[PDB]
Design an enzyme around this catalytic site. Structure first.
Site, mmCIF file in Angstrom:
data_model
loop_
_atom_site.group_PDB
_atom_site.id
_atom_site.type_symbol
_atom_site.label_atom_id
_atom_site.label_comp_id
_atom_site.label_asym_id
_atom_site.label_seq_id
_atom_site.Cartn_x
_atom_site.Cartn_y
_atom_site.Cartn_z
ATOM 1 N N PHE A 23 3.897 1.676 -1.843
ATOM 2 C CA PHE A 23 4.770 2.154 -2.920
ATOM 3 C C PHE A 23 4.415 1.590 -4.292
ATOM 4 C CE2 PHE A 23 7.804 2.684 0.732
ATOM 5 C CZ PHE A 23 7.688 4.062 0.771
ATOM 6 N N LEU A 94 -3.981 -11.006 -15.108
ATOM 7 C CA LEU A 94 -5.138 -10.297 -14.573
ATOM 8 C C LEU A 94 -5.954 -11.211 -13.681
ATOM 9 C CD1 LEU A 94 -7.041 -7.871 -14.434
ATOM 10 C CD2 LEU A 94 -8.108 -8.653 -16.540
ATOM 11 N N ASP A 136 3.806 -13.513 3.121
ATOM 12 C CA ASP A 136 2.756 -12.503 3.243
ATOM 13 C C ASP A 136 1.386 -13.088 2.898
ATOM 14 O OD1 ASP A 136 1.962 -9.917 3.968
ATOM 15 O OD2 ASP A 136 2.362 -9.059 1.985
ATOM 16 N N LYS A 138 -2.272 -13.978 3.418
ATOM 17 C CA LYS A 138 -3.400 -13.451 4.187
ATOM 18 C C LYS A 138 -4.557 -13.330 3.198
ATOM 19 C CE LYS A 138 -1.564 -8.777 3.476
ATOM 20 N NZ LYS A 138 -1.049 -7.512 4.086
ATOM 21 N N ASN A 141 -4.290 -11.250 0.075
ATOM 22 C CA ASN A 141 -3.412 -11.739 -0.987
ATOM 23 C C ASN A 141 -3.869 -13.050 -1.634
ATOM 24 O OD1 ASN A 141 -1.766 -9.492 -0.909
ATOM 25 N ND2 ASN A 141 -0.360 -10.385 0.602
ATOM 26 N N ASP A 158 0.893 -11.089 -4.727
ATOM 27 C CA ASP A 158 1.771 -10.251 -3.892
ATOM 28 C C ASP A 158 3.038 -10.937 -3.389
ATOM 29 O OD1 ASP A 158 2.929 -8.193 -2.489
ATOM 30 O OD2 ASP A 158 1.085 -7.545 -1.510
ATOM 31 N N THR A 177 2.060 -8.476 8.063
ATOM 32 C CA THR A 177 0.916 -8.033 8.845
ATOM 33 C C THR A 177 0.823 -8.814 10.149
ATOM 34 O OG1 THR A 177 -0.231 -7.552 6.779
ATOM 35 C CG2 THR A 177 -1.577 -7.723 8.771
HETATM 36 O O1 2AN Z 1 0.056 -8.577 -5.735
HETATM 37 S S1 2AN Z 1 0.311 -8.383 -7.223
HETATM 38 O O2 2AN Z 1 1.006 -9.612 -7.809
HETATM 39 O O3 2AN Z 1 1.134 -7.111 -7.495
HETATM 40 C C1 2AN Z 1 -1.268 -8.243 -7.991
HETATM 41 C C2 2AN Z 1 -1.356 -9.027 -9.132
HETATM 42 C C3 2AN Z 1 -2.504 -9.084 -9.907
HETATM 43 C C4 2AN Z 1 -3.586 -8.325 -9.505
HETATM 44 C C5 2AN Z 1 -3.524 -7.544 -8.362
HETATM 45 C C6 2AN Z 1 -4.672 -6.828 -8.077
HETATM 46 C C7 2AN Z 1 -4.733 -6.004 -6.970
HETATM 47 C C8 2AN Z 1 -3.618 -5.916 -6.158
HETATM 48 C C9 2AN Z 1 -2.431 -6.600 -6.433
HETATM 49 N N1 2AN Z 1 -1.353 -6.474 -5.610
HETATM 50 C C10 2AN Z 1 -0.840 -5.269 -5.193
HETATM 51 C C11 2AN Z 1 0.327 -5.292 -4.425
HETATM 52 C C12 2AN Z 1 0.914 -4.108 -3.956
HETATM 53 C C13 2AN Z 1 0.351 -2.868 -4.238
HETATM 54 C C14 2AN Z 1 -0.801 -2.818 -5.008
HETATM 55 C C15 2AN Z 1 -1.381 -4.003 -5.460
HETATM 56 C C16 2AN Z 1 -2.370 -7.461 -7.561
#
Ligand code: 2AN
Length: 274
Positions: A23, A94, A136, A138, A141, A158, A177
């Site tokens: 989502f 980032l 979560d 893994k 993450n 995440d 997971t």
């Molecule tokens: O974990 S987050 O902190 O959102 C996140 C933070 C910073 C960069 C991220 C890069 C790829 C995926 C993420 N997570 C993600 C989680 C769910 C769906 C899609 C991407 C990234």
């Protein structure tokens, strides 16, 4: 809590996609006013109270509330939050170096493994000190800042399953997971910071061997293996791994969460401690 309802496009330009989930989707972005770069996570809202598509506002608010608390070199941080009728948009720090998981696909030495592990533990120590369970953890993450260095810097990402543990345990069904969840999650028992320590044990096993300790042919098999603590150190994978490294893993992959090493224990364990 309500978030900024101006069009995020008036303040940011998006670029490369960094990640995609059930989502949500994360896009690289650049803030117009500073030229600084971020990761914008677009989370789809629930359109009705009883739907199962999108993320409930309670769950979105929980993630945002936890992220707002965080400032540590090994954990992702939050810059801003926007929203509109369809999405909540988190402007996150980032991280562009890709997943530890994808780095692993390219087995680590113990020194290389502990290089990463120590950063993960430091990040988790920070979270657990704030009574935040991640729930979560893994390889997917654990993200790198720069993947082209000897010892890359990592950030835990995440927080979609993360919870504050105000009473030492939460009773909620908080299911991630199968390969990485602790037996108490599999069994729908009260959950606390200890669940993360099990996940660290699984991560460590994978770092050192390239193999997953509980992975079966189906999700139900994996879950059954986790609950039974059905794992062993295969000689083909671990023959040249130190017994102390195995000891570290063994003290984390423990069914009774009370007997499992805590994050403080893990930092003082002879394999980790200087
Ligand atoms: O974990 S987050 O902190 O959102 C996140 C933070 C910073 C960069 C991220 C890069 C790829 C995926 C993420 N997570 C993600 C989680 C769910 C769906 C899609 C991407 C990234």
């Amino acid at each position: 809590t309500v978030f900024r309802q101006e069009n995020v496009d008036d303040y940011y330009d998006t670029g490369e996609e960094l990640g995609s989930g059930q989502f949500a989707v994360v896009k690289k972005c650049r803030e117009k006013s500073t030229g600084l770069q971020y990761a914008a996570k677009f989370i789809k809202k629930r359109r009705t109270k009883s739907s199962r598509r999108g993320v409930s506002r309670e769950d979105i608010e929980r993630e945002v509330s936890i992220l707002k608390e965080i400032q540590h070199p090994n954990v992702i941080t939050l810059h801003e939050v926007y929203e509109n009728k369809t999405d909540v948009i988190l402007i996150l720090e980032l991280v562009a170096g890709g997943e530890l998981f994808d780095f692993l696909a390219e087995s680590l030495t113990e020194e290389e493994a502990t290089e990463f592990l120590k950063q993960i533990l430091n990040g988790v120590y920070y979270l657990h000190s704030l009574q935040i369970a991640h729930f979560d953890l893994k390889p997917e993450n654990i993200m790198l800042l720069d993947r082209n260095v000897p010892k890359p810097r990592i950030k835990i990402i995440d927080f979609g399953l993360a919870h504050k543990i105000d009473f030492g345990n939460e009773f909620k069904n908080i299911f991630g997971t199968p390969e990485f969840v602790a037996p108490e999650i599999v069994n729908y028992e009260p959950l606390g910071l200890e669940a993360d320590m099990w996940s660290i044990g699984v991560i460590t096993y994978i770092l050192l061997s390239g193999a997953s300790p509980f992975l079966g042919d189906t999700k139900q098999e994996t879950l059954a293996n986790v609950s039974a603590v059905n794992y062993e150190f295969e000689d083909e994978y671990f023959s040249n791994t130190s017994a102390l490294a195995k000891d570290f893993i063994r003290r984390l992959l423990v069914k009774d969460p009370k007997k499992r090493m805590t994050i403080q224990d893990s930092l003082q364990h002879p394999w980790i401690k200087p």
